[PDB]
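Hi support team,

I'm opening this ticket because the web form for multi-chain structure prediction keeps timing out on my end. I have pasted the exact lines I submitted so you can reproduce it. The total is 873 residues across eight entries, so I didn't expect it to be a heavy job. Is there a limit I'm missing, or should I split the entries? Thanks in advance, R.K.
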Amino acid sequence: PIQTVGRRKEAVVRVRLVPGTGQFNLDGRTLENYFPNKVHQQLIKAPLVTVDRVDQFDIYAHLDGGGPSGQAGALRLAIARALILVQPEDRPALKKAGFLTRDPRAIERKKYGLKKARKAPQYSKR
Amino acid sequence: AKKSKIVKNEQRRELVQRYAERRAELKRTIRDPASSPERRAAAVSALQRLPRDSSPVRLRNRDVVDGRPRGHLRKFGLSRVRVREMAHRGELPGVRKASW
Amino acid sequence: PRSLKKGPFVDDHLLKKVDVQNEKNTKQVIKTWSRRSTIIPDFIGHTFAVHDGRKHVPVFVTEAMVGHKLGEFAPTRTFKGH
Amino acid sequence: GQKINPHGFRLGITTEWKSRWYADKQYKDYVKEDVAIRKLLATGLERAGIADVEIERTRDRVRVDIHTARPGIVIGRRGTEADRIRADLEKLTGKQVQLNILEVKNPESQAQLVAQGVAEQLSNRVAFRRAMRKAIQSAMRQPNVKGIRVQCSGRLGGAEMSRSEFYREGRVPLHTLRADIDYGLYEAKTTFGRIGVKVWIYKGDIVG
Amino acid sequence: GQKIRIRLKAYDHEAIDASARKIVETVTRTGASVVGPVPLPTEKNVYCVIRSPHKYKDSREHFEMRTHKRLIDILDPTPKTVDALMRIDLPASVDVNIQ
Amino acid sequence: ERPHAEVVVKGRNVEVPDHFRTYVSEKLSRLERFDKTIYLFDVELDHERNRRQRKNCQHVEITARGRGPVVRGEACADSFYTAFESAVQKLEGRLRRAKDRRK
Amino acid sequence: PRKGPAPKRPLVNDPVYGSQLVTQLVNKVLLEGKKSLAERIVYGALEQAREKTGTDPVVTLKRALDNVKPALEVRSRRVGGATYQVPVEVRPDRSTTLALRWLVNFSRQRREKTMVERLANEILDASNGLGASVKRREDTHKMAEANRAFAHYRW
RNA sequence: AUGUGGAUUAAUUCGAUGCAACGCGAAGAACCUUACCUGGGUUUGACAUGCACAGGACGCCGGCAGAGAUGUCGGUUCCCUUGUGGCCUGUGUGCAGGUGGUGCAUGGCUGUCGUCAGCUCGUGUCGUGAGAUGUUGGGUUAAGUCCCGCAACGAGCGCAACCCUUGUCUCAUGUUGCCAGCACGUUAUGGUGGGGACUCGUGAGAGACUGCCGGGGUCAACUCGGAGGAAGGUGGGGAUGACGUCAAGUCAUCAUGCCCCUUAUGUCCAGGGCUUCACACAUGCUACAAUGGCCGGUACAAAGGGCUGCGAUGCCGUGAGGUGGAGCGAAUCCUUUCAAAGCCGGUCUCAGUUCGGAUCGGGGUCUGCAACUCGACCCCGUGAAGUCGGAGUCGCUAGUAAUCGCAGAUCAGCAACGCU
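Hello R.K., no limit was hit. The queue was backed up. Here is the completed structure from your submission:
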């Protein structure tokens, strides 16, 4: 079977990519039921946009972890990796825009003596 | 802190262990329901006859080694200073400097 | 505020002393150490005094002084100004 | 906070715990038991110096261990002082004290014992120069002392000053994480006041 | 069938894995059904502290007492095996809930 | 802004007969006279109370606001007068520096 | 940046049309991380533009950008007792940044009861040649004309 | 909202003092803490130990005088085995204790310049000597990291790096969690068997090493654009403080040399204070609105806490709250199958305003023996200043800043809007 993963800052999604139409199903709903956010929709679509195969490959997801934008990046990631399982030959033209990488940029540890990550207390001189 | 003050907190724990066992408990039990004899109990006025030390609010988690009445960690059961010192000497199980 | 299921805080010392007093039927100035005791209308006869960290203050009682503590009628801090 | 203890910093990796057990509700209890133990121990015996004190707890057994190069001074020869120790430990109620006494192998590469011996030398009437120098010599002539740093401080020689002067030799890279390090911090009496002593002993590396 | 469940608690991972192998061995010594130490979570009791006395609240430090935990489900609890596994020897660092 | 010179008087533990105030307020107006960029002046009286002093019995730190940089003057003496006048001189040094470094 | 610059970010494109000037605008009106809110504000204002002049809003936006986009601006330097302004050519990046910044922040202090109206009608103003954005652009060009005399430092 | 200064004060306990203090020692000051004050008892004592002399019972459970300290009857009047003891009644003798002073007598611990790149030694040669040399001069670096020519040759403590977390993958690992392929419950649902396949929680190892490309480069380093990759040029953030100064701070976390109290600066007691305010300084938040105020409807995170305790559903209360306890030493159970921004519908339509919430008068809840100085919380009415901020300053280079909310150590309940 076809199964690949997507993870963006604690936002995991599994994927079933089938050769059917572009039917989207995302935990008992669709992309027009959830995600009222069009930039997020662009992210979600950009791999099929790239390969010009929009409505050539059904996708079925199970969302968990993270918030909408994290889940969105993880979704588009997993869809592209599933397209690589469909055929890797398109891969080195996808690195040309790099829609394939895991986002190596996660939330930071909060430090001691300070108010958050990098915002220091006001160095008062009185 | 002081010998006398550690001794007094130790005395107060003994008092509480005696009397809040059941004596300063039954009045609470009977006086929590609205079937209570409060209308003629005088059980409130009788709990005024017991010593103030009967109540646990007068206690305090002092360290066993020093008696620092502040900065006390119930899991280690110690003043933060002694906590530091023990974990520095490597004298507590599986305890270490971590990151994340 | 004192909860109602618990009722009032009328403490044993002056409660029992004023039992003794109204059963003597006689009224005089009577000292007590308890700021934390709540007031009953049965105190409009007697005169009570309390300590405030330095010395004692007497105070005479009125109808609308009920439901309160005696410390509310003792000056605890003096501030005459600068 | 100029230099934390290498023992306390390598504790996660290279050096090892001095009181192994497991407890959830009895943790506080076991630690207060342990400190009262070690305090009564040091308060009873002080003439020959303890090298290490280790404790372990089980369902009902209790295994307390004491390293010292001079046992005959410490222990009951007939059993006197060791039975006294079991007596104190039964007042504190460990309830099954399998007191395994041990003598160490290298008294001059045992950091704490060396610092305690030098501290005694100081506390008697002596200067610190010859003691420090001979300590360095005695440690470094033996095999495994690759690097040492002996650090004496106090009102040294009665000089009414907070002083700090040390004598080292060899290699003491405390940042070499993989390598075994032995640390000893010991404070000694004196006519004038209290002196401190620290000693770092480096030992090879560890591969594993 | 039947089960007997062990929940092993420790702080040393080397040693909890060591006793895991030992207990699985002693369960296997009777030809009794043995499963293995499933990789289940660990608690992390964490405590921040300040270093110095009397001031310098900005300088601090952290400490982390973990809790290594392993479930071992033994099937086929032949009562000979049960009373044998009641009597395994271990060092002090590990504790066990036999339920 | 002439009575706007925010005097701050301070002493942790020293016997304070009321003339230290006179001396200090006047020795502060002293330098108010010739620098108009000043808001606060903190004035402190401190004392080591050690047996066998090392010729430092009383100690003074003064610190003053300015438009941008601040002014910082420390002095130490055996009594009030040497220390106050010394710190006043050191303030004038800092201030002369700053007012030569104005144009 | 004592060692060298870092590359400028891989900007997004507009999801709907394909001009990243739009996302530049939405990122510069973005306020407390409410990007989709600023975005629906954007779409609404742009649809106002389309239904109020029968054109594609991005073209008239380019129009207003052409109006207010400067070429020459100021750069200050304290020198010799009287701190001098100096004329500087201004590359396209900073030009566009500054133009959109003026345009947004002067849409802010308008009087239309609502940002969708303040913004949109200010865009109309700068487009067809009337707005306070154009006013401030002229002010800056006149200042450059003023301090022409000091170009010769060549900084 | 809190932390200080100054002045009140019977008492407002002490220390900390630009950088490196002022949401500090506090991680929870009503009594307690507390060290401070009025008033009362104590004096080898609130608790011990070394001596002997007089003891065999001593306590504990209730009663009375009492703000409490404290003195006093009713019931407890031992086991050793003749030598004495557990024990406590006294008598005093050794005393015992101090938050009394010196942090410029000391140790220990810690901040700081400063996570800045340096600081030293050997043996030598030079110099009468203090001292120099090395460690100068070019390339070069995040850096005394490295290369090249030389009275220097060599090295250490440092910078790098083996540590943790995160970033990717192969194998196993199957519940207390997933649950694609399957069969069964159907009102709430993985809820139950069934597959460990994807996830996965926990562990082991490969992956970054300018690894290879070609043009530059003392041909050396040092680079310039590449492929491949999940990451590529110290992946990122963490941990980590060279020798020492500031006689830095803490004799009040603790330890302690010296001086002092001892009928008391010790000590047992209830009340009061550390929250006084014509003001000043500092830290933050809540606001000056339509990106906003209000009702209603819809989905998701990480994450931890728990037993003489976390507390579910039902119902009653406006709502804090409530008998009650299912289940729970806990990948389950309380933790709504875990949220707020946001989205959809509509109103308010730019004004001291449905903004804002002070402030007060009352109606009330919980815990604590006790809510007046003095506690948090809901409800009613209350509706103040505030219409974007001065000279200058503070913090920020990416998952950062700005914003929304959650969780918690300490803690019975709290000023916690702090801290993590």
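A quick check on our side: The first helix of chain F runs from residue 19 to 32. Let us know if the file doesn't open in your viewer.
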